[PDB]
Amino acid sequence: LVXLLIXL
């Protein structure tokens, strides 16, 4: 969702 945070 945000780069590699929270999935993509």
Author numbering: 1 to 8
Q: How do the authors describe this structure?
A:
We use computational design coupled with experimental characterization to systematically investigate the design principles for macrocycle membrane permeability and oral bioavailability. We designed 184 6–12 residue macrocycles with a wide range of predicted structures containing noncanonical backbone modifications and experimentally determined structures of 35; 29 are very close to the computational models. With such control, we show that membrane permeability can be systematically achieved by ensuring all amide (NH) groups are engaged in internal hydrogen bonding interactions. The ability to robustly design membrane-permeable and orally bioavailable peptides with high structural accuracy should contribute to the next generation of designed macrocycle therapeutics.
We first tested the ability of our design pipeline to control both macrocycle structure and membrane permeability on 6–8 residue macrocycles spanning a diversity of structures and N-methylation patterns. For 6, 7, and 8 residue macrocycles, we selected 8, 5, and 19 designs (representing 6, 5, and 16 clusters), respectively, with fully satisfied backbone NH groups and funnel-like energy landscapes and spanning a diversity of sequences, structures, N-methylation patterns, and structural motifs (see Data S1 and S2 for sequences and design models). Selected macrocycles were chemically synthesized and purified using reverse-phase high-performance liquid chromatography (RP-HPLC). In some cases, two peaks were observed with the expected MW; in such cases we experimentally tested the two peaks separately and refer to these as p1 and p2 in the design names. To evaluate the accuracy of the design method, we determined X-ray crystal structures for two 7 residue designs and fifteen 8 residue designs. The structures for two 7 residue and twelve of the 8 residue macrocycles were very close to the computational design models (backbone atom RMSD < 1.2 Å). Having found that the macrocycles fold as designed, we next investigated their membrane permeabilities using transwell permeability assays. Eight 6-mers, five 7-mers, and sixteen 8-mers had apparent permeabilities (Papp) greater than 1 × 10−7 cm/s. Of these, eight 6-mers, five 7-mers, and ten 8-mers had Papp greater than 1 × 10−6 cm/s. In our 6–8 residue permeable designs, the number of N-methylated amino acids ranges between 0 and 3.
